[model samples]
Target: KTITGVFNSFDSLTWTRSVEYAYKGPETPTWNAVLGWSLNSTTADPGDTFTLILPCVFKFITTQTSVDLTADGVSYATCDFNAGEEFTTFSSLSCTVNSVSVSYARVSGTVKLPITFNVGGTGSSVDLADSKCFTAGKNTVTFMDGDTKISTTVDFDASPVSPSGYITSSRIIPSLNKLSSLFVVPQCENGYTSGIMGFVASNGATIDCSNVNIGISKGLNDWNFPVSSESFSYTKTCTSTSITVEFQNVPAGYRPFVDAYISAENIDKYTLTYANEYTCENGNTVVDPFTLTWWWYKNSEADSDGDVIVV
Candidate 1:
């Protein structure tokens, strides 16, 4: 088995420049402590799309007093030490704290207001931070002084779901019945006749129609309608394991049929059978029994017509 490298960002923490000040007065003065910090993902595939469901909790650890404030202007002062604030984002891939609370005491006391916030970046962005501010006292307040410490943590996991497969190729088959009609002479008539054939191949293969010219050029008289065989090829890629095939342009006059065969190394040999019945708006009838693995068609179209037929 091959080892596929899954790229993702793990848990991260960071601290910003601290804010300090001093206030000396009476009447039990108070001071507001404001600090800024952020959180984000720093992985190899940082910008790659991924769904992150982060169950986060923010905590405030102080020596003298409990920190109180709002997050992004949302009321959270009533929040407890263990019950922290939680928010999510996919744009900037980060979160920030804009404000917090602080109170003054009768006597001089130092406090370390460590704000712990946590969340996930959803596999995007390089850095995230939150800015905090503290306020204290009323009109004609007394003295206030000192600083506060702030910090944050982030936790997240990537969503395991992925999108369905897409189309790879579509084409039309020329009138195979015409082959016999063109050679009507008893000495020149061949068994193969008027009928169209088309096929769609999946995987990493490609179908190039730039040089294909399909038109009826019977002897001296010919029709100007586009009549070129639609053809494409398929090849294997690192992530892809299988391919699908489809067809079009089946003549209504004749009962057209399609047969597909797929051979892969160290894999099973598979063959599919399809008949052209309904014609599309583009004047091309579709075929069925397009070959594809179960995982590739999960919750998708089970029939080959709705399969992701690659070019």
Candidate 2:
């Protein structure tokens, strides 16, 4: 009887640089892989076992090491470690065939097992040089069947860097109130949020533009707009309380920024007049600049409780 080990390509084996939002803080690195065993038409007996030798670059995040293998509503094999032993050496994990399943001739064909490895803590960075980082490329795992040995090699790319900065500064200019000596309602920046609002990244850090969003609300009216990271159609809804701006991707070392005018003529469009009960004078009103609440989002989280006024 012959047994062979291989890596399953069908499984969703993925590795991410950080398991949590980078803005929240440094995050741990997580990865998972799939291992496959082929019986090659040979039945696995009760005492038959296999061992998978792990790379030293990773460790078990959980103590539980055994899982049941079943198929077609019937028990087939059981995978576990040796008695009173574990990855204590950060070495190999062994799995054994179940006696009952073998007696019923259920262990056969191919079996796939999935495993997850943790290489870092929440405060760790997934840099290639960091021990907390899994060594990428040409990772080898050895499998043993009694006296026979099989080794499988998997390739991995370096983890991606996560953005970890906040919006250091921002500005939104309202539409002009008086132009050509006449009261005017300037079209709110009709297409995209960029060029109308200016956002500055904090501490020389780049912000992930796709995760940034703009929200405008006053009184009971609320509106939020999304930014596009890929190629797509751009359309905007016009509201005095909020104007639609097509969001563009922010490049590395750059932050999203938009600026637009907020004036007395366009005050009613944004629903701002009702909340602060301010009158729209014949010209750009500044008698008592009305307070309008503006909010923005970064890294998929909201930031508000601050106020702004259009002068």
Candidate 3:
């Protein structure tokens, strides 16, 4: 129902800020942009944690999570914006945000509030006759007496500044509907081809952690470990192209259940699953239900020779 006020290229176009959801334990989540949430309830349980996927629209600052949301009154800290910024004083308008509510959800005020930019103080060195306050563009400016903060794109300029130079936004509420789709799932197909044969062991490369117990299930089909060896827990590591787990040596008695470590794979025909999604604030939040299942064939109309020759 709200917008960034104006679409001026002169606006904080350089600002790439987007609000995000608290990180979920690990379905290994990132800001989910594909599947948008569908909140069906007026309130939610504090015990459940939800994630809000965000758009990378505002300027990225790794140190942005500097303020503590629940720190009662104030905490002394030293920080500055660009070298040009002279004085900075932050203000958190509603400090009781922990116990706040929104249109779709509610919380127990248990989550930690991230640190933010301080705003407003009397203008000094590099001083001007009249002082300027923080403005908003992609990122919104917030105010509390001592809670002033600086933001991207608002330096002294000829362009008229947006009223607050920002919007007052709470974290994007999770889809009140628990079963909401959160990412772009691909359309899986029924095909007669071999998929992945096996996972290369961490003895292969590992998540850069020391070797330990390992398992990889195809789906609900859980990973397998031999019945005999005493096992230790392990770390799971992933590279851009592969999800691999290395293992500690299994001291064997008999019937050790590990297959040959291929350290490799070669495919003749591969059919894959497309359960992917796109996520971001302005992006999407879908759980691509474009599901996939198996498709099989006997000999096929054509022989393995690329020939559908009539026998």
Candidate 4:
């Protein structure tokens, strides 16, 4: 399980507007009337903070060329709104050129202004005509300039749920086995017998065999009273029906055993070395040295074919 969070911020200056006014007579003409404006702050998140610029609208009724507006130590452009170009809404006038610092002023009067700025012209006398300020309780701000008004506020914040689990699973198991074998026989018998033989048993059954020798062991070297024997063990599942075996080390004198055994009693299979012709006790008269070899197959269901063990 994992958790993550994202943070973001938005600028409020993109929606603010200002208006300017001018004066001509010796007495300052005050701009009268409250600016009307409103905004919706329904999309802001619970912990998110927002800053807004209160809309300031001014009407330049004076004969001066321009009027400047300043707020919060920052000046705004001087707008030239005269009789020919009357100012109403805050967005209509471009007061981006004037320089006048505007800040909240506590006058002795009953009404409190959140922001106040002096109106002045380049050449002639200028007056403020009128000005108004509106308070934003938590996430809202508004200002008034004569009959026109504008307002701004923060909106509701966006919230998203985190993912619950990992995208992938973890756990793997493998099952498989491989087996292999090799055999070698020295040359001791020739002419009458094959040199060697090999066999392979699989799943408790003989599957394959190879004959390196041609004749029985008797035709090759003479054997002592006791015959030499070797044994090996292996494991396999019940499904394993046949075993494959290869023969090597063929004697020169004895013929190789090319026959396969599939008797019910020998369900697994067995390899036999026949030496009916050679007699023991004398090593000289026996066929010269030779070799015999083969392999085995096990657990096969099909009838064992001619010399070919079929499972």
Scored by TM-score, the top model is 2
Models sorted by lDDT, best on top: 2, 4, 1, 3
Tens-digit lDDT track of model 2 for 1-311: 22325212223344444322131111122344444443322445555665655433233323456655554555445566332111122235565555453234223334443333322211112211123223445554444544445555555443342222111112221111210000011112222222223222222222232222233211110001111112223333333333333433322222222222233232211212211111122223212212223321122333232332111
Residues 1-311, model 1: lDDT tens digits: 11111212222232322211011211001212233222222221212221111122222323332233334443222212222221221111121121224321211212122332222111111101111111122212111111222222222122121111111111111111000000000110121122223333333322332212222211110111111222222121111222222223323222222222222221111222222123333433333323432111123334443332210
Worst 10 residues of 1 by lDDT: 177-186
Residue-pair clashes, model 1? 48
**Candidate number achieving the greatest lDDT relative to the actual structure:** 2
Arrange candidates by TM-score, highest first: which order?
2, 3, 4, 1
For model 3, the local distance difference test gives 0.20
Q: How many collisions per candidate?
A: 48, 24, 67, 128
Question: How many backbone overlaps does candidate 2 show?
Answer: 24
* lDDT, candidate 4, 9-94, per-residue tens: 11131221222112211111232222221111232222332221223332333345443333343433233432211122231222
The CA lDDT at 33 in model 4 is: 20
Which runs in model 3 stand beyond 4 Å of their true positions?
Answer: 1-67, 70-73, 76-209, 216-311
Candidate 2: regions farther than 4 A off: 1-12, 16-30, 38-44, 47-49, 60-63, 81-91, 101-311
Q: Which model is ahead, 2 or 3, in terms of lDDT?
A: 2
- Estimate the lDDT of model 2: 0.30
Comparing 2 and 4 by TM-score, which wins? 2
